[PDB]
Amino acid sequence: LRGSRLGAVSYETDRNHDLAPRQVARYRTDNGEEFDVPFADDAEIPGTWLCR
Amino acid sequence: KRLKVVAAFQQSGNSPMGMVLDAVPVIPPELRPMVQLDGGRFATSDLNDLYRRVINRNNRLKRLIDLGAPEIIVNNEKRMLQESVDALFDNGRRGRPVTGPGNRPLKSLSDLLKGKQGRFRQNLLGKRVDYSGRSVIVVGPQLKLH
Amino acid sequence: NSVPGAPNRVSFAKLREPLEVPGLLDVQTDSFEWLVGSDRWRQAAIDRGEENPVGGLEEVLAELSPIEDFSGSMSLSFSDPRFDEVKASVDECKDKDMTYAAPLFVTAEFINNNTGEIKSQTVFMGDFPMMTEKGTFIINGTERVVVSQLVRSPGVYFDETIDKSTEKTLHSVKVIPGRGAWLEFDVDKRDTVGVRIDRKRRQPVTVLLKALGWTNEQIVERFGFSEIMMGTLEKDTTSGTDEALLDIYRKLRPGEPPTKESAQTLLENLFFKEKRYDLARVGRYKVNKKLGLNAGKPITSSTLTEEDVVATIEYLVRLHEGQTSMTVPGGVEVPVEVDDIDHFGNRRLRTVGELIQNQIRVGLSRMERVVRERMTTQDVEAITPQTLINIRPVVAAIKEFFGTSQLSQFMDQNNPLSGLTHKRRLSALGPGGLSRERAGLEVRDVHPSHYGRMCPIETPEGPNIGLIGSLSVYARVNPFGFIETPYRKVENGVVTDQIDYLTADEEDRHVVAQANSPTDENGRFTEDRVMVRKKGGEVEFVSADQVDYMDVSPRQMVSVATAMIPFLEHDDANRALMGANMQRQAVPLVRSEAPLVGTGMELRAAIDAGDVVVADKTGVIEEVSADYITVMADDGTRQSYRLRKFARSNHGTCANQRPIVDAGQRVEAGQVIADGPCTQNGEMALGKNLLVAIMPWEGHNYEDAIILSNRLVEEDVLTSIHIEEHEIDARDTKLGAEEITRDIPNVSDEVLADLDERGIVRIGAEVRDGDILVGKVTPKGETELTPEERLLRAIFGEKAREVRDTSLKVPHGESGKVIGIRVFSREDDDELPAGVNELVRVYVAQKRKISDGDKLAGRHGNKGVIGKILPVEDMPFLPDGTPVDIILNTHGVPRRMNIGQILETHLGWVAKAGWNIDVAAGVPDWASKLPEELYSAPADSTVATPVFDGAQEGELAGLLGSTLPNRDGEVMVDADGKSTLFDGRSGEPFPYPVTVGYMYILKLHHLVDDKIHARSTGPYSMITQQPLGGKAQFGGQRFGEMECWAMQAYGAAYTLQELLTIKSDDTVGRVKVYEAIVKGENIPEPGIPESFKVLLKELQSLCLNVEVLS
Amino acid sequence: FFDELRIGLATADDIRNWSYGEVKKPETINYRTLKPEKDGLFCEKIFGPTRDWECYCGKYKRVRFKGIICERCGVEVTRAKVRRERMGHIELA
Amino acid sequence: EVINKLGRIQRELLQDLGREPTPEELAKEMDITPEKVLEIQQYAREPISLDQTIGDEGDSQLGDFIEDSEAVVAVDAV
Ligand SMILES: [Zn+2]
């Protein structure tokens, strides 16, 4: 038998010396906890976010 | 005998909050894979069903409290939630086990590491290895000892 | 006289056979014909004196009818099943992948009491599989066999136990029905009596006895003689004829409301009414003879009565009392004894017919269950048998039995002997029987009752030893399912010509003499005392006049395979078992030769096997060809026999048949006209007879290894043909349909040079491993090519097609020539699976020669792998120049206790070179017992040595001394069976003479080709991320805990870590190590195996705070 | 480096710290597209993408977006192997 | 609801004709194409569990013999 994980796997080399700029936005929840989310420089940051 | 447990809980670095669960963790999906066999036949694991049982009831209770139903139905919902969590952790430890299609108890989180199979007995202390082979042997008298 | 055209094989037999070997496939055909109520079966049953015999189907239909609606207003009945004709022939079913079956028709009748109008007509019941002429079934094209299952016979069996605390003996009785709830009566740990029903709470017998209507006075009157029964009665305190029923209700089934009527009905609801409890007509018979009840008259009611319970209680009481016999008013006197569980007076075999009957009964029970609702759902005017009868459940059950039951197994088709022994197998396993995990050591032990019924030698050597047996040669099955065996009646001390078939219990009543005992021409015993077996299964000397029966032949106790081992007496049973098992693994060779020294069974074994073709009518051959044979019978009819050529058996062997007749030859009915795979002139030929010298040779035959001459490779002496089947299916996917096309992406134009115009490999082309057999492509979907791949595409003039290559290819290590292709297409109305558009099957045939590592074996349990194949000029050779073919080591014979191979070698040498005993001054002393025809023989003269009536040692020595010379008029082997050999390498003669002769060896199916496998890297399991196992597609070897212990003992810390992390489940480490090896860099150290990460995640998910501290 | 292994007792805070997102629905995958359903089991927003360096909405499909969390569906551009390392939690009423 | 209706019609037709129906018959009865009938049948297909035993023995499990089609073949990756 053979199957699939409903996905795909590749082998492109991972790099960290050249990465996109991140403008992290921090969201505060009603319960008082705060969570940070890194978004690209394109902005369009949503006013509300579903946290962890 | 009671002092044994009391001292175990005394200055042991852990609080007694652990025996009451305010939330339960979910195992990563790839450890409970949903895969499509060759020919379109899907395959899953029982852990998914046992998890859904916990979610569904947990949702229904949230409705019953929202609707302000009398305490009988809310109490029944809480009891079923308790039973569902118990089945998720150790299916069959209390009452009859929950069974899936056919007739077989659903494997729980405790059943995949306690029984004859499971990590502690199986998939540990032995496994298959690459760069290996096997074949029939015959006598060679022209060889040296090495 | 045996077979019309049997070859003349002189026999050393000294005892004349009073009875011939019966048909070896009868155990299947007779049972199946009983099931379907064949006319010849009915005639045979009438010949025995049966009043109105009834078949299995008729019996089940009669027990089902009449179905009623619990109101008495209407009834449904079934009767007279019938079969019209078979849908298709055997070969057509086999090649079209369809079941060999016939339609079943039964006449149904419907009655309405309120009006009297009755409607009767034939109803279709379904396609029922039919037994072929050879005792097999064809299911979905494949050939299956159903084995008989040994089971505890229903009845009452008494047992004795000892309480250890008091060390006191006590007795109990258990009753087991065909269907129902079990019950037992028991004696307590100290002078008390108890009873249990349906495993429920233990209760005294007095309560049950009172609940059945026996008042205190009646109980005292009947059981006043006993001591413990009266003691318990005084100890007992329950009272009342009806109140006892409530007591039983609360003891067995407490809690539920004990209404008086419910308790009154419950006791008879599952014991005394056939609706829920039944002995299946065999338990009834067993109880009738055990207790002597209803002697001489059958009982239509197979269920329990009230008389039998009290009879069993009386039997148990008298057994506990120490009585030797007991009697019941109205019956007959019977002895009082304990019953042993393993005695064939208690075990019975249910054949294929009874298993199919049980499955049909379950299906019909489901059918009537549905009909019960359908009665109420319908109304009087619209209800009719066609609408009222639903055949789906019975058809489904029948389809389930053959395709799922453990008893129904793939036929073993290595050679005719293997298939013949498969059909005669006796299995203790299967549903309703024992289990390998629950099988104790006691049930596997040999028992005296097996003599003449189940062979003690032939049994698997694996964990299934003793659980799987083999039916004896002369054994036959009684209608009740008990194995009978024939014995010669002895009257007034002289053996009679009358033969009686006796069961084990019937045999125990008498003392049986052995056929080997000597008798005069008039049948009177010549000796004063006779060797006999007694009731207890013990051997003794008994007076001549005290014997009642004598064995039919010395072969009575052995099976078909065990009877094919010559000199069986000189081989220990342990090695005889090995020889019998290995005779069933011989592969069919390209050319077959019958054994030079045989036993005489090989003839009847082959003809009954079913792989040979025998003429059905006396006549003259019209024309002969490699494909078909035409016979012109005397009466004016013409017969045509079609021979299957190069057909593939279930185990991948060749099934080629060839004619042995020529045009213008007159043949007789039953004469063999075409040989099967492992036969020569109608005689079973599993191997080859070759020249063997017994000596150690330079250590190349060390530890059971074998040395072969290169001649056996040059002349294809041990060459075989193996045919493999490869299958590929084209079935549509969500992204589009996959199709078989000649053109496929990213392949050279030379790869598809051997593919037909429609993309299938051409017949006759040689194919290696990895070669394309069937080109196929599948839709791929999104491309998302990496930029480097797009650039490379731009460099060349190629573009990415939307299809993946998934063509069929030859597995690794496989090769040969394509000999056949079969194609099924949905476009041509073929019975393809759901979603499958096309199916292609390709057959590849390869000719395998004998090579190093192949396994050879004799008939005496002597086996070994070929370690060296020497050139002809290197082998030791006889003084006349003949080189020996095989060399066997001396050291292996003496300890293994299989000296029969030495006798076989001597007699084979005697047979190859003819012999002539001088009779100048009368017959020599050692030749007094030899028959006349054995006083001379030419070269290559085949001889027969019956298994227990074969050649004696003195005769063999004399024949060795009286062998004919060679062409040069000089003897090569002296009277000791030895000869002076010359060394092929140095040329000097060996200092001492060596034993030389001819031995028969078999080529086993443990060839190297299908066992060697290796793996550097390959597929990985998706769940456990470890290399997957199996022989196919680069499986990996397992490193168990014992190997880990050995590594730890060596102190090899690094090798163990490498084996457990790098090579098994270190996902990153595997690729990194492969990269390092290919590039030629230092191996990186391993990380964390996936197993430990999964363990940590499981622990965390189980609410455990497992953490790692540095 | 490994020195010792400790097995404590897990509280609600520990489970919430391990959790990457709460499971709200019993959904596993779409019956028609077979993609994982959001906010439920197999959710890619919580347990990670099913395809290496891709995104559920497909906007991001290159390694350069490594570490970026899509603002349209909330998936993080990371290798699909991470789906066997990410854990969720269920809040009980 | 569509699946339930298809099942009920299939049971009715099977009971009326006794033998199994055909995709053409279902298409004719339900006023949908046979391919749509096959699609509904596929949508009604329930999955199985990897935890089921396999190999005619109780030790092995079904998931033991499933290849990882997405595994990173080393020779390519290098
Ligand atoms: Zn997105």
UniProtKB/Swiss-Prot annotation, chain A:
Induction: Constitutively expressed during growth, increases slightly in stationary phase (at protein level).
Top-level taxon: Bacteria
Role summary: Binds to RNA polymerase (RNAP), probably stimulating transcriptions from principal, but not alternative sigma factor promoters. Partially restores transcription in the presence of rifampicin (Rif) in vitro; overexpression leads to an increase in the Rif tolerance in vivo, with smaller colonies. Seems to act by removing Rif from its binding site and preventing its further binding. No longer stimulates transcription in Rif-resistant RNA polymerase (with mutations in rpoB).
Subunit and partners: Monomer. Forms a complex with the RNAP catalytic core, specifically with the beta subunit (RpoB); its binding site may overlap with that of Rif. May bind free principal sigma factors.
Similarity comment: family membership: Belongs to the RNA polymerase-binding protein RbpA family.
The protein, known as: RNA polymerase-binding protein RbpA
Swiss-Prot record, chain B:
Organism domain of life: Bacteria
Transmembrane segment boundaries: none
Intrachain disulfide bonds: none
General function of this protein: DNA-dependent RNA polymerase catalyzes the transcription of DNA into RNA using the four ribonucleoside triphosphates as substrates.
Membership in a protein family: Belongs to the RNA polymerase beta' chain family.
Description of how the protein assembles with itself and partners: The RNAP catalytic core consists of 2 alpha, 1 beta, 1 beta' and 1 omega subunit. When a sigma factor is associated with the core the holoenzyme is formed, which can initiate transcription.
Protein name per Swiss-Prot or TrEMBL: DNA-directed RNA polymerase subunit beta'
Organism encoding this protein: Mycolicibacterium smegmatis (strain ATCC 700084 / mc(2)155) (Mycobacterium smegmatis)
Gene from which the chain derives: rpoC
First-to-last residue of the parent protein present: 294 to 439 of 1317
Curated annotation (Swiss-Prot), chain C:
Gene Ontology biological process terms from the UniProt entry: DNA-templated transcription; response to antibiotic
Keywords in alphabetical order: Antibiotic resistance, DNA-directed RNA polymerase, Nucleotidyltransferase, Transcription, Transferase
Keyword Nucleotidyltransferase among UniProt keywords: yes
Gene3D superfamilies associated with the record: 2.40.50.100, 2.40.50.150, 3.90.1100.10, DNA-directed RNA polymerase, beta subunit, external 1 domain (2.30.150.10), DNA-directed RNA polymerase, subunit 2, domain 6 (2.40.270.10), RNA polymerase alpha subunit dimerisation domain (3.90.1800.10), RNA polymerase Rpb2, domain 2 (3.90.1110.10)
Enzyme class: transferase
Molecular function (Gene Ontology), one example: DNA binding
Subunit annotation: The RNAP catalytic core consists of 2 alpha, 1 beta, 1 beta' and 1 omega subunit. When a sigma factor is associated with the core the holoenzyme is formed, which can initiate transcription. Interacts with RbpA, which partially restores Rif-inhibited transcription.
Name used for this protein in its record: DNA-directed RNA polymerase subunit beta
Organism for this UniProt entry: Mycolicibacterium smegmatis (strain ATCC 700084 / mc(2)155) (Mycobacterium smegmatis)
From Swiss-Prot, chain D:
Residue ranges crossing the lipid bilayer per the database entry: none
Top-rank lineage group of the source organism: Bacteria
Annotated binding of Zn(2+) 1, by residue: C55, C57, C70, C73
Assembly information from the UniProt record: The RNAP catalytic core consists of 2 alpha, 1 beta, 1 beta' and 1 omega subunit. When a sigma factor is associated with the core the holoenzyme is formed, which can initiate transcription.
Functional note: DNA-dependent RNA polymerase catalyzes the transcription of DNA into RNA using the four ribonucleoside triphosphates as substrates.
Family: Belongs to the RNA polymerase beta' chain family.
Protein name, entry field: DNA-directed RNA polymerase subunit beta'
Species, as recorded: Mycolicibacterium smegmatis (strain ATCC 700084 / mc(2)155)
Residue span relative to the full protein: 6 to 98 of 1317
